[PDB]
Amino acid sequence: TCEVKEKGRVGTINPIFTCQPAGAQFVSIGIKDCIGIVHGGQGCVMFVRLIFSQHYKESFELASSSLHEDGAVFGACGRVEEAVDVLLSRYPDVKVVPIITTCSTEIIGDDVDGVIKKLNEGLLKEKFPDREVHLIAMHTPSFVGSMISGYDVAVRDVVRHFAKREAPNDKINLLTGWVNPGDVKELKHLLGEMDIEANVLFEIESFDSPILPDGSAVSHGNTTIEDLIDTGNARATFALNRYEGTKAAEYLQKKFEIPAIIGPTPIGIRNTDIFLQNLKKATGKPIPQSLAHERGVAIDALADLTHMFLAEKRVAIYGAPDLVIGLAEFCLDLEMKPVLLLLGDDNSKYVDDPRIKALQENVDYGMEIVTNADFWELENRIKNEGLELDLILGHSKGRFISIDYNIPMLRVGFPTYDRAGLFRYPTVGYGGAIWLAEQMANTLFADMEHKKNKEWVLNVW
Amino acid sequence: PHHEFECSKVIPERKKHAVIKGKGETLADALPQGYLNTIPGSISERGCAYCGAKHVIGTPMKDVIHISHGPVGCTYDTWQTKRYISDNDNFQLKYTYATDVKEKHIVFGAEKLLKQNIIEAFKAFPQIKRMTIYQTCATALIGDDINAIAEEVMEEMPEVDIFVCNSPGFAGPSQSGGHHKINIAWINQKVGTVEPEITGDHVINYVGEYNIQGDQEVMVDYFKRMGIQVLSTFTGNGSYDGLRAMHRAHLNVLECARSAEYICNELRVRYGIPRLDIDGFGFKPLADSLRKIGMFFGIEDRAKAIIDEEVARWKPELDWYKERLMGKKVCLWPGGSKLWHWAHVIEEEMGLKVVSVYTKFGHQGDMEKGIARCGEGTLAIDDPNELEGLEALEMLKPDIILTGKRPGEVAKKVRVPYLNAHAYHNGPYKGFEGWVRFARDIYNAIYSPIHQLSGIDITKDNAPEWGNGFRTRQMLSDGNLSDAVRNSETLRQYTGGYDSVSKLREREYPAFE
Amino acid sequence: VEAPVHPMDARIDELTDYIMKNCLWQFHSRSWDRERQNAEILKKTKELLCGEPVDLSTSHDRCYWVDAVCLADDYREHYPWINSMSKEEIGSLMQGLKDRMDYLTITGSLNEELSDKHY
Numbered sequence A: 001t002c003e004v005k006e007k008g009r010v011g012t013i014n015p016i017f018t019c020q021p022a023g024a025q026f027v028s029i030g031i032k033d034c035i036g037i038v039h040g041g042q043g044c045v046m047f048v049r050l051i052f053s054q055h056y057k058e059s060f061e062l063a064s065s066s067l068h069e070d071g072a073v074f075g076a077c078g079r080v081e082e083a084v085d086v087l088l089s090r091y092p093d094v095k096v097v098p099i100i101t102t103c104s105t106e107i108i109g110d111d112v113d114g115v116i117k118k119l120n121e122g123l124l125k126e127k128f129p130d131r132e133v134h135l136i137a138m139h140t141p142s143f144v145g146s147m148i149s150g151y152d153v154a155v156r157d158v159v160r161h162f163a164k165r166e167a168p169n170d171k172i173n174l175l176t177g178w179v180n181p182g183d184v185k186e187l188k189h190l191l192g193e194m195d196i197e198a199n200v201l202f203e204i205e206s207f208d209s210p211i212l213p214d215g216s217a218v219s220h221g222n223t224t225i226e227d228l229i230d231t232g233n234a235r236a237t238f239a240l241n242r243y244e245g246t247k248a249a250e251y252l253q254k255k256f257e258i259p260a261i262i263g264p265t266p267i268g269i270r271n272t273d274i275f276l277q278n279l280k281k282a283t284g285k286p287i288p289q290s291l292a293h294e295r296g297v298a299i300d301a302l303a304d305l306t307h308m309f310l311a312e313k314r315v316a317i318y319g320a321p322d323l324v325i326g327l328a329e330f331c332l333d334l335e336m337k338p339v340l341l342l343l344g345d346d347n348s349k350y351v352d353d354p355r356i357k358a359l360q361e362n363v364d365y366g367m368e369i370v371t372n373a374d375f376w377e378l379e380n381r382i383k384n385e386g387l388e389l390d391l392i393l394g395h396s397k398g399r400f401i402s403i404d405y406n407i408p409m410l411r412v413g414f415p416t417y418d419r420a421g422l423f424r425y426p427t428v429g430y431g432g433a434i435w436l437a438e439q440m441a442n443t444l445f446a447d448m449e450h451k452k453n454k455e456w457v458l459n460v461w
Numbered sequence B: 001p002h003h004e005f006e007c008s009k010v011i012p013e014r015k016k017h018a019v020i021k022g023k024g025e026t027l028a029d030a031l032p033q034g035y036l037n038t039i040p041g042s043i044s045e046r047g048c049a050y051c052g053a054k055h056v057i058g059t060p061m062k063d064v065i066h067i068s069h070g071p072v073g074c075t076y077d078t079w080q081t082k083r084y085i086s087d088n089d090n091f092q093l094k095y096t097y098a099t100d101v102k103e104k105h106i107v108f109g110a111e112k113l114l115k116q117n118i119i120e121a122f123k124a125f126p127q128i129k130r131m132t133i134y135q136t137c138a139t140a141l142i143g144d145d146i147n148a149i150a151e152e153v154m155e156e157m158p159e160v161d162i163f164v165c166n167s168p169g170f171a172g173p174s175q176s177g178g179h180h181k182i183n184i185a186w187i188n189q190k191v192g193t194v195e196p197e198i199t200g201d202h203v204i205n206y207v208g209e210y211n212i213q214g215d216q217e218v219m220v221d222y223f224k225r226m227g228i229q230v231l232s233t234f235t236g237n238g239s240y241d242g243l244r245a246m247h248r249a250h251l252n253v254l255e256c257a258r259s260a261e262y263i264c265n266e267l268r269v270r271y272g273i274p275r276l277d278i279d280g281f282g283f284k285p286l287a288d289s290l291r292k293i294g295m296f297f298g299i300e301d302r303a304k305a306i307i308d309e310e311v312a313r314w315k316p317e318l319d320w321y322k323e324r325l326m327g328k329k330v331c332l333w334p335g336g337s338k339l340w341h342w343a344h345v346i347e348e349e350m351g352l353k354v355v356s357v358y359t360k361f362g363h364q365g366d367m368e369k370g371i372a373r374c375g376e377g378t379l380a381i382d383d384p385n386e387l388e389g390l391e392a393l394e395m396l397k398p399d400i401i402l403t404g405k406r407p408g409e410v411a412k413k414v415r416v417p418y419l420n421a422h423a424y425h426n427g428p429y430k431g432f433e434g435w436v437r438f439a440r441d442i443y444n445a446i447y448s449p450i451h452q453l454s455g456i457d458i459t460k461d462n463a464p465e466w467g468n469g470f471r472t473r474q475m476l477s478d479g480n481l482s483d484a485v486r487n488s489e490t491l492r493q494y495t496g497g498y499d500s501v502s503k504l505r506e507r508e509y510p511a512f513e
Numbered sequence C: 001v002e003a004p005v006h007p008m009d010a011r012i013d014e015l016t017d018y019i020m021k022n023c024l025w026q027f028h029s030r031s032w033d034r035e036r037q038n039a040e041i042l043k044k045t046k047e048l049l050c051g052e053p054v055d056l057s058t059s060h061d062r063c064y065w066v067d068a069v070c071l072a073d074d075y076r077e078h079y080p081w082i083n084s085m086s087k088e089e090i091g092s093l094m095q096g097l098k099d100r101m102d103y104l105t106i107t108g109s110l111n112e113e114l115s116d117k118h119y
C-alpha cells in the first residue's frame, strides 16, 4: 500500500530545495523591468543568481542590501534605503523592485513595510518624481517552508500589489507554476487552440536569449505591470501548481471573487484532459478537434512504449511537490510503479492533497511518500534497506545517487544543470507527455546498453 | 591615476576603487582602495563571509562532515557549485549537511537541534570521525554556543573530533572576513593537537591550495618527485588530522596568500616556520618556485630535473598557442590571487595583452601584486559591480575574459568569450601541462567558429557569400603566420588526454632514502 | 615621504622593474615583516653578487637565501651589465635598491593595512 510518512531524522543530509527567498527571486526575474533587492547578506542573492545560471546558463539581475556587522546588531533598514537609491540611480528602466527578506532581516526584525512607505512618500517623490516605481515587500524567512513556498508567497505579493478590477474581461489568469520556457510555450499553445486569452504568470520564454551580432540581447521576463494589474479583471484564475499558486489564486478569489481552479498539475494525458475540461467549464469554449488529434499523436508515442518497456518499472521521484505528484500519476497510467516519492520540505498540507488521498486509496503495491525529505532518504534506502529501482526522475542535485548506485535518471524539475537544453522542452501537456515518456524510454535504453541487459531487444519493438 | 566609470559617477566613492596604471606611476603614486564595505544596490560581484570560510576554505577537506548550523538554504546554495576534488572519492562534493533550523528555534535556540544533528550525521557516516560546524547568519543571530555543543559531543564521543567555524554571512564585507576567521580558528583550536609520523628529511605544509580540478595533485606530484613529504595541504585534498599537525613543518609553501597568509603568519610567530610565497601557474614562476623549494632543502638537483623534463615535454605545445594568441587582449577577472599569479607570466608566455584585472574581495596587497605585474595602461578594479564590468567590456574590447560562470554569461550576450577562471574549463591549470591546457582553452574560446558566426548579421543586404559549410579554428587563426611558424617541425597542439590528473593517482614515487 | 634618489637610479629603475614583475617576497603582510624581508634578502643578494659568503645558520636564512640566489642569477643573466661592475659599485647599487624597495613597499606604500597589529 501507499504509506505517507515524515522523515525520521531531524536534520538535513543532502537537501532537495533551498530556502523561501530563492523562490521569491525566481518570481521576480520573470517580470519585465523588475530587479529585486534581497535584504540580507550578500550570499543570499549571489548564490541564488548562480542557481539560475546553473539551470539556464544566463545571468539575471538581482541586487543585495549588503548586510554587514553593524546592521545585524542595530537593524538594517538603512541598508535597504541606500540600496533602493543606488539601484534606481543607476538602472533608469527599472519599474518593479521587490524587497525580499532573508533569515537575517526577519530575525533582527527590520520593518520592511515601514521602510517602503517611507521611500514612497520620501525618496521616490523627491528624487524620482517622473518615474513609475513599485516597491513590494516579500516576507520570506528561510526557517519555514522552502523555495517552493517562497514562490507561492511572492506570486501572491505581486498580484496583491498590482491587481485592480477596473475593467472586467474574459481573460483567465494562468499561473503556470515554476516551470520551464518549454512549458510556457506548451501552455500558450493549448490556450491558443482553445481560443482563450490569458494573463500568463510568468512569461519567461525570453529567458532563452540570443547572442545577436550587435550584442544587444539579455535574458529577461515579459510579464508586465499591465498584465499583473489585469489579473484583477479575469473571469478565473487557473493555478496549475497548488504549492506555487494557491495563495495568489485564493487572494484574487477572496478580494475580487475571481474563481480559483487549483490544479491538477497538467502532467500526463489524463491531467492535461482535466485542464482542458476545466477551461471549457470556466470559459464555455469547446475543446477543438485539433487538440484531440494532438492528444492522439501523443497517445501513439506512448502506445509504442507502455506495455513493452515502461510497465512495472520501479521509480523514485523528487523535486517540486506538484511535479513529483503529477509524475507519479502519469507513471501509473504508463503502467509503471513509482515506489518512492520525496517531498523535500515541511509543508503540512501534503497529507490533505486530494491527489495523495487518491494514491492512498488506489495504490496496491509497496509505495512510500516521505515528507520533509532529503536525498539521504533515497540513498539510505538504496544502500542499507535494499530498495530496488529501475529509474529515477528528478533534478540534477540528486545526480551522484544515479551515478554511484547505477540507477539511470531522467532530469526533470529545477535545477537541471548536468544536461544541455532541457529548459526548452515541455513536461506539461500532450507535448510534455511525449517528451517524458520518450525520454524515460531513451534513458532506460541507454542503461540497457550500458549494462548489456537484453540490449539486443531494441530492434523490433 | 584613479578611474571613474560613467555608470558609477552617481556613486563617487567608486572612483577610489579603480586605477589605470599611468605612464611612470609607481605603487606610491596610486593604489585602489580595498576591503571596505559594499555599496547596497550596486550589484557587486561579492558574496558572504560564510562563503569565504565554509565554501572556499573549509569544505575542500576530504574526510570531514561539513555541517552548516542554520536553515537549509545556506547549505543547498553551497552544494555542487565547486570543483575541489579529492582522493577520498569526492566525499566533500557528494555529502553536505544542514541542521534545518526552524521558527521554534528562533526564540528558544537550536542547541538541542544541533546536537541531534551531529549524532545523526556520525551514525549515517560511521567511517567519518571528523566534523566542522559552520555558523550561518541565523545561528549567529539566535546566539547558540556551537563551541560548547561541540565540546559536549567530543566528551561523550572520544573517537570523534569537531572543529567550530563562527563566520556568518554578515561578518564582514565579503569572503575575506571568513578567510581570516577560519584561518585563526583552525590554528587556535586544532594546530598542535596531533603528532605526525615523519617519513622524510624534507617536510612542507602546502598552504593556500584548494585543489580545483586537481591543482593540488599537480603540485604535490612535483613535490613527491623531489622526495619532499607534504605534511598537510590547507585545504585542497587535505586531511583534517593532517592539518592538525601543521606545527611540524620545516617550511610553509604559500600559493594563495590572500586566503591563507593569515595562518602562515601565525605559524611563523608561534612555531618559527618560515614563509615562502610561490606561484602555481606558468613555466617561469613555477620553475623558480620549484628551484627555491629544492634549493631550500639542498635538493635543487631534483627540482632542476623535473623542470627540465617538463619544459622539454610541454614548451613545444605552449609555443604553438602563443604564436596564435599574440596581441589578443584579456581581462583577468577572478575573485583574488589568480589575478596576480597570472598578470605577468600570461603576457610573457601566452603573448596575451592584459588590459584589466579585478578583485571581488581582495585587499590593497592584492592590488599591489596586481599592478606590480601588469603593464602600463591596465585597469585595476576593486569590488567591481555588473555595470562597471559591462562598461569595461565596451571600453577595453578584450578578446577573452577569465572570470566566473554567471559573469561569463553576461559577457556572452555582448560577444565576449570567457573561460571560467575559478572552476577552470579543461583544468587543472597549475603545473606545466596545466598551462598548455589553459592556453588551448583560450585559443578555442577566441577562435571559435561559432563566435565568428555570431558576429555575422544575416539580414544585411550587403553581406558577402560563404560558399563553405565550415571554418576551422586554424583557418581563422593561422591566416597571417610566418612560414617558419606555420611550417614548424617542433610546434604542435596539445597532445595530452582529457583528464590530466587521474594518471597521477596511480603514479608510484621512488624513495630517495 | 619623498621618493629616494641615487646616482645609479637608471640601473635601479631596471632592477626594481624586475622585482615588481617577478618576485613576491617583497609583499608580505605587515610593515615589520616587509622591513625584515627587504633587508634580509637584499643583504644576501649583495653578498652573492659580491662573491662574499652568506650565513645559512637558521631556516629563515635559507628561505631568504633561495629568493636571493634566484634574484642574483636573473640579474647576471638578464642584466649582464651588472657583471662588469666592482664590489664597490655593486654595494652602492644594492643600497640604492633597498631604499627604493623600502620606499615602494613600506614608507611610500598606499597599503593602509600594513600597520594592523593583528594578523
Ligand code: CLF
Pocket: A019, A021, A040, A041, A042, A043, A044, A045, A047, A101, A102, A103, A104, A142, B048, B049, B050, B051, B070, B071, B072, B073, B074, B075, B077, B135, B136, B137, B138, B168, B169, B170
Ligand atoms: S549571507 Fe551567507 S548564504 Fe546568506 S543566509 Fe547568510 S550565511 Fe547564508 Fe542562508 S538560509 Fe537562505 S541563503 Fe540566506 S536566506 Fe538565510
Ligand SMILES: [Mg+2]
Pocket: A056, A057, A058, A207, A208, A209
Ligand atoms: Mg542560453
Ligand SMILES: [S]
Pocket: B045, B046, B047, B048, B174, B175, B176, B360, B361
Ligand atoms: S566576496
